Design a protein around this ligand. Structure first.
Ligand SMILES: [Co+2]
Ligand SMILES: [Co+2]
Ligand SMILES: [Co+2]
Ligand SMILES: [Co+2]
Ligand SMILES: [Co+2]
Ligand SMILES: [Co+2]
Ligand SMILES: [Co+2]
Ligand SMILES: [Co+2]
Ligand SMILES: [Co+2]
Ligand SMILES: [Co+2]
Ligand SMILES: [Co+2]
Ligand SMILES: [Co+2]
Lengths: 443, 443, 443, 443
């Protein structure tokens, strides 16, 4: 209780609980199918938003009131944050965290310097790690903040930058393997363009592919076993980011033979910024077999930039979780809270309140989706809707016995064709009924 | 001059011309590189917007004043339109048109009936064709208007509909081959979803692929030589259309081994509705080697639906044409005016005025792009910008002599890395200078 | 049971009900504060979407399967629809309907003709009305469908059209007064522009104002007592509609002295299309004292056009209803279901299913908002948040005792200023708790 | 040449000029109607973007290479910037600049401290001012950057903040009057909301109005003669900003009796972010008689946040300038370049290149608009389009001799009504012709 003395370890208080520092729906311990609820959800904290971020926006200064802000020595701060991390996870009941290499340790004048400094904090992280139960869900290299990357990393126009980026990723892969990460994420924040006038699209996409596979070859050369995750985003900071979305990123991987090595880390706000719903992007990832992990936030659909808010909407969490359950639940991934407090929610307790809200909403949603999937209510409607492809000519079609000519013959004279209603208004009311059903079974 | 007696054949009148029924920039005959300008641009009329469409919008009745509207007998109208088509192209100087099978001939009670009726008009089209110089750029089947397709065509939930759709496409391929079309287009207008709740995404995408290849196999079985074009659109009428954009459609083709057979027909308004610029979508198509053809319109970026306006913006036409020239110009495609007059531009002369405006804008843009490409002004800046990948470690990288380890070695101690400016503000002013340059060389 | 023989009168079946033709949350009879629930909500059917509309979209033909479609004589159909209206309301338990003058009766060759034809159906409506309990919530003139209005009605460039529009509105006001309407709505569907190039903005806004007040003067001259409602919409069909939103329309009214006579009919989908949330638009209307009535639908935030879906989202209905309750509930207005079935929900039962879903969602939302308002949970937080304006200099400010000079004096030396957290993450979790609370008290 | 030794004073080099540090269209000295071109345009630099801003974006560190960055003492930097300002304006040929109070001088621990520090730099600004020809177009107080304003300034929930804000504005008004500013701008950057849950909309709007008028009363008490400008913005940083746009802000002013004292400073990117075109917002301001000044930038319509780019599009500059000319040109306002270089355009020469590009584009646009307005080409079409309101019943309507009854009489039997085409496709081609015309008359 050194850092956040006023915050106690958080416990479950049930559906009617009134205390803001209590879980209303998330019972970490509750077992479902022989697994405690915590092992279904695999909640994780994002080091960047929670410990580094201080409420600065394009028009304003940082607002956050954080304990480690007294330490003015960059290294004291870096260490203070590592300690706060573990205390935070302990009280909030979390067992996973994610970080960028540049989140944990300040940079030196050279890469060598930088790496040395980096090792210092990594070692401290490992001590507190084994003393605790928190683990590394995934690690990643920040290839977008430093001016060096203004024209991109792998897609830069400067070979020196390409080299630096390859070296940084190398280190990042190393410390991730050392800390036992389940995955390694690629967010191409500057891998895109601001204008086509100065962009050799084809060249940049080639270098990007060379980079990706150099990374997969080195992962082999060091016996790294984590899952490689690509995190799509349509834009911001760039005008167009290359991994625009699942389908686009897939197209690039498949196109260059890199797909077998990658899965996707889908973020709600990224999905909606590309004009897709969160569910859509999850389903796509799923049928491709690459639903890797999830960054659990929530954007504002009436705003054109990532708001990165804590998820407080049961409709979204339900449809999201429905996809995960149908994919078979998580393997080497989970619900990393890539979200942040509103600038005005600047008090330390708001960090806690925010994370609790997200966990409750996702927990409840998981439970609603669990019923939907168990009763099989949606799966039956769908099975009935595409019924004709099981009987008659339908099956001939699917099996491949038919061609255009045989289809013309079959259909040439048929006058009226019978069609099912879509029932959308009905299905939606159903989601409401299951929300009500589940709430009634809540403790 | 039977249909549009008040409109004379349109001729070039030069840059300072004042008459709205005159080309100011488009000189059909002007030869560039041994080809008249008309053979670079390959302008084409869209039968649907020009002859069938009458200004109806979701909130209002049709407004168009068209000659063929006296004929109340559906067939008289169908024939009246075929005649107007050729007169229109003659006066407006156009040599290509595109049509949907359901644009040219009313439907019967059965497919057989429908096909018979269809043959009647196709024959009349062929007579007037050989008597004229207009040709079929591409044909396509309307698989979205008739209620039968409310749940899609290839992605329908009813095998009967799948069959009907296969049969209709079969006929469409036939009459396209007969009329000598350069290509056959697929617009999946209803090939998408309105809700995921009733959608088996994976199944629909499978049937879609079966369909596409049945179509390519039958194209073989009839010695059809036209290019198969897929026309991407992100949405409308659907919430999500499967061929969302170039990259997405590519991903699906490549994923199912259908890519070698297809190229893309890119439409400005579709590009921008998916959150892309027209140029972006053209460049993508280009580096994939599938810049097939273009539907030349212009959307309104502040409106969320296809406005389908005539292109009157030289910046857009310049960047668009720049991509075509760099792709090597058209082969089996061209600038089909998939655009329509504003509801209030309901007079017959507005049809002409609209098409002239689009042709001028595209002609001028072609000329600006032609200079940009000739002076090689942009290509030099780009060649200089990625220079480091030719010298030193840069080339080692590209050639594949380097790995992460060797890159770490090279970069481990480098303190400062030198970067070029992006020059975006400069490049943009350049586009302005070339617009001014070209205008000064205009007759 | 003549028209919809297969549909029985709908009754309440409770929260756990499974039957799609049953209310789960809406108990018409349940009394709250001495009023049955039906008198709080005042649900109403929209004649246009339910009886006239048949599922036609810009890319497709109508799909709806409706009983009255056998009658091919326009008048038989017009009468068949009036009968269906009352049967529909009876079974679905609704007591109000809204209509456009052009929804109920086909048009003649002249206004005189048209009015005669109109009287025929109005009389039939009045008979079945007194035989039933359904009433007219509000009436309105369709000033956008007929080609005559392509350039607007009051904002047209043709004085003849202005005249026709004034005459049509006159008739509309008359039959509304005759049928006992509670209000008369103005939707300026064509009162806007598609381009500024041909628009004399100032003139059109002047004629619009002349029109509005001619209408208020004639309402006096006939002793009409209904509330005049303006229904804002940012666009569609126009590029820009003049009554863009509450604030904009207010600005125009206030600017021309017409505000005292009008209130607003707020539509969810219109609010969100203008970049506002439904709640925002309701609150604005409320503090202006002009929260007149509501068109209860739900748009799709990822689509740029009115989807006009049935409301199935409890978050929206809760925040919406919260505003109504705080405004004091309805007076001369209610929840008109200006929504329509999805094109694929083409069966008659879907009309019922759709309306039931909307009513349930709005009923439940009303109940959640009712608790929020009763416990006063939000009002207390707000009272505490702006506390400093009650004590000290705060009150001096509000009362007007202070000026800049006195404020400079008070503040010139104050070093640190204490600020409250915004608690957004907290407040949102609260809305979730009240949804859960209310569901537990549900029968 | 101390700060930017490598940049010479910029001169006009004409339409065919190739040198990026030369004006191609902007000839400062060229007289039009007895005024040099510089007095029509009144170009101005924004202190914030040019001197303070360094290319930092939400995902990245600052990139800018600026001379004054060696000075690590905050005050040395503050003074270094004032010197650079005047050198910049001299070389770039600019005679006006705009600044925020917090742009020019670092803040102290108390307001008193802060004001003292502020006076130091203001005095240095005044010396170099009288030694030069640059003037203050407008000044403004930064009421959004400092944490104190996280809940707003005038709309804050803390009376202390309200007081501080009133005091800061007081000082700002003072130094603006001292430096001879033509206007004083209000940008309510934090005057809006992020959530309605914690917002007493009515109260905040009341305090906002109290504030505005306290400001107008003190402007009187000090004999300030500059024009008060309100600068609308729909959002960012807030979810909803109160002065959403011209009409909304107008509504609030008019509603509280503050309108007679204010005019609008319209910004392109703000207009388009609210779903309006730049021209639309200018026309509105114009017919209200409050087209005060312009912030000349250009947003990216496919991005949902302010990009604040330098204007390089002649279509936009033409329609914008067309409105200014029609308003009668500038009085106490001008074209302040509230724009910034792309992050990658980090070299000092790019600052110059960017500003030159904007000035050329606006100069050329001014010239195109000047012809449009002189030939009166658009005004004639419009005069002809609304012709019927001059003759017959049309005039009776406008003059107010008509009512609904007389209009019913006039129109009751009229069968067909004749309507003009809208000619949009024609008018747009015209804008192209005038762009070509003007370019040919360019030196
Ligand atoms: Co400690
Ligand atoms: Co994100
Ligand atoms: Co993320
Ligand atoms: Co003839
Ligand atoms: Co289209
Ligand atoms: Co098209
Ligand atoms: Co009957
Ligand atoms: Co609507
Ligand atoms: Co409505
Ligand atoms: Co010096
Ligand atoms: Co701005
Ligand atoms: Co500004």
């Amino acid at each position: 209780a050194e850092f956040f003395p006023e915050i106690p370890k958080v416990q479950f208080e049930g559906k009617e609980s009134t205390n803001p520092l209590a879980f209303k729906f998330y019972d970490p311990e509750e077992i479902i199918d022989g697994k405690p609820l915590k092992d279904h959800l695999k909640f994780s904290v994002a080091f960047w938003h929670t410990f580094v971020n201080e409420g600065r926006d394009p028009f304003g200064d940082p607002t956050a009131d954080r304990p480690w802000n007294r330490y003015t020595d960059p290294m004291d701060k870096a260490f203070a944050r590592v300690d706060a991390l573990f205390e935070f996870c302990e009280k909030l009941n979390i067992e996973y965290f994610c970080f960028h290499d540049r989140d944990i340790a300040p940079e030196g004048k050279t890469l060598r310097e930088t790496n040395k400094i980096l090792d210092k904090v990594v070692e401290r992280i490992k001590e507190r790690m084994k003393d605790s139960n928190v683990k590394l869900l995934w690690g990643t290299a920040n290839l977008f903040s430093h001016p060096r990357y203004m024209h991109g990393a792998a897609t830069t126009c400067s070979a020196d930058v390409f080299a630096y980026a390859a070296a940084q990723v190398k280190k990042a892969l190393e410390i991730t393997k050392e800390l036992g990460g389940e995955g390694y994420v690629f967010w191409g924040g500057r891998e895109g363009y601001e204008t086509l006038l100065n962009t050799d699209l084809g060249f940049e996409l080639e270098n990007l592919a060379r980079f990706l596979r150099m990374a997969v070859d080195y992962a082999k050369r060091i016996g790294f076993t984590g899952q490689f995750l690509i995190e799509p985003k349509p834009k911001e900071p760039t005008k167009h980011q290359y991994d625009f979305d699942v389908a686009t990123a897939y197209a690039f991987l498949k196109s260059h033979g890199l797909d077998e090595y990658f899965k996707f880390n889908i973020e709600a706000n990224h999905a909606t910024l590309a004009g897709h719903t969160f569910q859509h992007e999850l389903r796509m990832a799923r049928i491709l077999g690459k639903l890797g992990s999830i960054d659990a936030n929530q954007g504002d659909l009436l705003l054109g930039w990532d708001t990165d808010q804590f998820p407080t909407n049961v409709y979204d969490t339900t449809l999201a979780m429905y996809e995960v359950i149908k994919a078979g639940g998580f393997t080497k991934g989970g619900l990393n809270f890539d979200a942040k407090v509103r600038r005005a929610s600047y008090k330390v307790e708001d960090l806690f309140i925010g994370h609790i809200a997200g966990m409750d909403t996702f927990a409840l949603g998981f439970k609603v989706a669990y019923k939907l999937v168990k009763d099989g209510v949606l799966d039956k409607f769908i099975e009935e809707k595409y019924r004709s492809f099981r009987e008659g000519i339908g099956r001939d079609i699917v099996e491949g016995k038919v061609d255009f000519e045989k289809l013309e013959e079959y259909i040439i004279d048929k006058e009226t064709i019978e069609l099912p209603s879509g029932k959308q208004e009905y299905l939606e009311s159903l989601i409401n009924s299951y929300i009500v059903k589940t709430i009634l079974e809540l403790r």
